[PDB]
Amino acid sequence: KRLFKEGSDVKAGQQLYQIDPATYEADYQSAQANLASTQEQAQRYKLLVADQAVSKQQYADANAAYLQSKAAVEQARINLRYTKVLSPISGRIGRSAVTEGAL
Amino acid sequence: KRLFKEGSDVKAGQQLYQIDPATYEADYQSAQANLASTQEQAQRYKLLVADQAVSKQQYADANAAYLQSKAAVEQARINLRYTKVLSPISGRIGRSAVTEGALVTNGQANAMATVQQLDPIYVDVTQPSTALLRLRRELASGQLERAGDNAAKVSLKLEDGSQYPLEGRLEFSEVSVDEGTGSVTIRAVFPNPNNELLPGMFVHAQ
Amino acid sequence: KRLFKEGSDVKAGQQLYQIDPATYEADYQSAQANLASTQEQAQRYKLLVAD
Amino acid sequence: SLKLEDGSQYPLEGRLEFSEVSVDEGTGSVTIRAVFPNPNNELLPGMFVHAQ
């Protein structure tokens, strides 16, 4: 959708466009699922090496994936956020040089 | 299939194309099968740790796969949904630049079809910034037939010279300015219920 | 469910139990989805080698 | 005050800041900016005008 009237007045921070978020929203929820998982996995292993119950290697590999996840999620979050195009400033906005459905 | 007549009228939300859903529909059903499985597996293990019957590790790995599945299904669902191309808006759709049996890719540059709303229809008029101010005044006073909160009533004279049977509003809100020539462009809105008016016509608002 | 009264009379062919079909029913629909897919894929390719 | 290209006299009055904004080192000319209020959008960019 292109939620603004060509020639109208918009406020800085106002959503001007909406990029189909279906998948971004999807990847993000996916990412978070993963993180929630790995995080736990790690936090647990962190107490097992503490008791020799698990090799330093294992806990390493664990905390390794945990970081990877945390990383992925943040990146997912950012892309999702960008699906809502906003107006950098406040002023009069003109014609939309892009058509709905455009790519 | 390409379920629409080139040159016809489509309603927003109307299926315009149908991408072979064979595999997507297949992957989706597949995904759901998997989820249905892992989900149960997890829900069970959740009661086993509750009774030490199973290590926290196992229940973890379980709920882990469960989440992965739930994830996959949702993604499957979305792709399947996209196999049914729909019209973003209501209007007149032209000639499909894609024929049944063709291969289409998500991200492809060229666009399959193009819909257009032609009723009402705009008439882009360009005047010198000064001239627009003038009329804006003539409106504020009364020298002009107030059409709306900020528009004047206007008639249209086609290129051939004929008088367009209907009357439209000429909104004074600027839509674009040519900082170069300093010219302004405003829009008139006329009714076009019989599609007598088409884009590109050179006309004159009176 | 265990749809029968202990001590009752049952007829041969009568459902006596019901195992949660949730997944089986799921795998089956899944399977058919797949087949419907591959089948088409094949039937098409059968005419392409032909040419 | 501002006088439009049609000769009209823009009602509102504005500031003419003297801090230079740019210099055409070629012609040595200097460019400064006036700041007028435009609450009704009567004023649009690209208008050739005179600051009085």
The secondary structure of A51-97 as a DSSP string is TTSS-HHHHHHHHHHHHHHHHHHHHHHHHHHTTEEE-SS-EE----S
Strands B121-128 and B176-178: unpaired
Whether B105 and B169 map to the same domain: the answer is no
The secondary structure of residue D7, as a DSSP letter, is: S
Whether B88 and B39 map to the same domain: the answer is no
B124 vs B188: CA distance, rounded Å: 6
B136 vs B81: CA distance, rounded Å: 49
A25 vs A19: CA distance, rounded Å: 11
Q: Do B108 and B161 touch, CB atoms closer than 8 A? A: no
B33 vs B13: CA distance, rounded Å: 30
* Chain C and chain A touch, per 3+ beta carbon pairs within 8 A: no
The H or E element that residue B128 is part of is: strand B121-128
Task: Decide: helix, strand or coil at residue A42.
Answer: helix
Beta-carbon separation of D44 and B130 below 8 A = no
Whether B51 and B16 map to the same domain: the answer is no
Beta-carbon separation of A40 and B60 below 8 A = yes
CATH number of domain containing B139 = 2.40.30.170
Q: How was this structure determined?
A: X-ray
Residues 2 to 31 of D: which have CB under 8 A from any B CB? 4-6, 8
Resolution value (Å, 1 decimal): 3.2
CB atoms within 10 A of CB D25: 7
The secondary structure of residue B4, as a DSSP letter, is: S
Question: Percentage helix, strand, coil, to 5, in chain C?
Answer: 55, 0, 45
- Output b/e per residue, B59-95; b: 16+ Cβ within 10 A: bbbbbbbbbbbbbbbbbbbbbbebeebebbbbbbbee
- Residue B40: closest CA among B51, B48, B29, B28: B48
CB atoms within 10 A of CB A101: 17
Whether B136 and B191 map to the same domain: the answer is yes
The angle formed by the CA atoms of residues B88, B15 and B96, to the nearest 5 degrees, is 80
The residues, any chain, with a CB within 8 Å of residue A7's CB and separated by 6 or more, are: A92, A93, A94, A95, B173, B174, B175, B176, B187
Which residue in chain C has the smallest CA separation from B24?
A: C37
Whether A67 and A47 map to the same domain: the answer is yes
Which residue in chain D has the smallest CA separation from B177?
A: D45
Q: Do B189 and B121 touch, CB atoms closer than 8 A? A: yes
For A36, A44, B61, B65, the CA distances from A59, given in Å and listed in that order, are 17, 9, 16, 20
Residues 60 to 79 of B: which have CB under 8 A from any A CB? 60, 63-64, 67-68, 70-71, 74-75, 78
Task: Decide: helix, strand or coil at residue B86.
Answer: strand
Amino acid code (one letter) for A38: T
Q: How many CA atoms lie within 13 A of B47 on its CB side?
A: 4
Whether A15 and A42 map to the same domain: the answer is no
Amino acid code (one letter) for C39: Q
Strands B115-116 and A91-92: unpaired
Which domain, by its residues, includes A29?
22-81
- Residue D36: closest CA among D6, D8, D9, D16: D16
Instruction: Report the domain count for chain A.
Output: 2
The residues, any chain, with a CB within 8 Å of residue A88's CB and separated by 6 or more, are: A12
> In the complex, which subunits touch D with 3 or more CB pairs below 8 angstroms?
B
Strands B91-93 and B115-116: antiparallel
Whether B48 and B127 map to the same domain: the answer is no
Of the residues B65, B92, B117, the one at which a domain ends: B117
A64 vs A52: CA distance, rounded Å: 19
B4 vs B143: CA distance, rounded Å: 49
Whether B7 and B102 map to the same domain: the answer is yes
Q: Do B115 and B92 touch, CB atoms closer than 8 A? A: yes
Task: Decide: helix, strand or coil at residue B155.
Answer: strand
CB atoms within 10 A of CB B37: 19
- Residue B84: closest CA among B28, B17, B24: B17
Whether B43 and B12 map to the same domain: the answer is no
Whether A15 and A28 map to the same domain: the answer is no
CATH number of domain containing B41 = 1.10.287.470
* Chain B and chain D touch, per 3+ beta carbon pairs within 8 A: yes
Beta-carbon separation of B32 and C34 below 8 A = no
Residue found by looking up tokens 């460019």 in the block: D31
Task: Decide: helix, strand or coil at residue D33.
Answer: coil
A96 vs A1: CA distance, rounded Å: 11
B185 vs B205: CA distance, rounded Å: 13
The angle formed by the CA atoms of residues A35, A39 and A43, to the nearest 5 degrees, is 180
Whether B11 and B91 map to the same domain: the answer is yes
Whether A37 and A71 map to the same domain: the answer is yes
B1 vs B102: CA distance, rounded Å: 10
A45 vs A53: CA distance, rounded Å: 9
For B121, B123, D41, the CA distances from B189, given in Å and listed in that order, are 6, 6, 21
Rg of chain D on CA atoms, in Å: 13
Q: Which of C20, C23, C33 sits opposite B25 (nearest CB)?
A: C33
Amino acid code (one letter) for D19: S
Residues on chain B touching C41 (C-beta within 8 angstroms): 22
> Torsion-angle region of residue B45: left (phi > 0), alpha (psi -120 to 50) or beta?
alpha
> In the complex, which subunits touch C with 3 or more CB pairs below 8 angstroms?
B
CATH number of domain containing A100 = 2.40.50.100
- Residue ranges of E strands in B1-120: 9-10, 91-93, 115-116
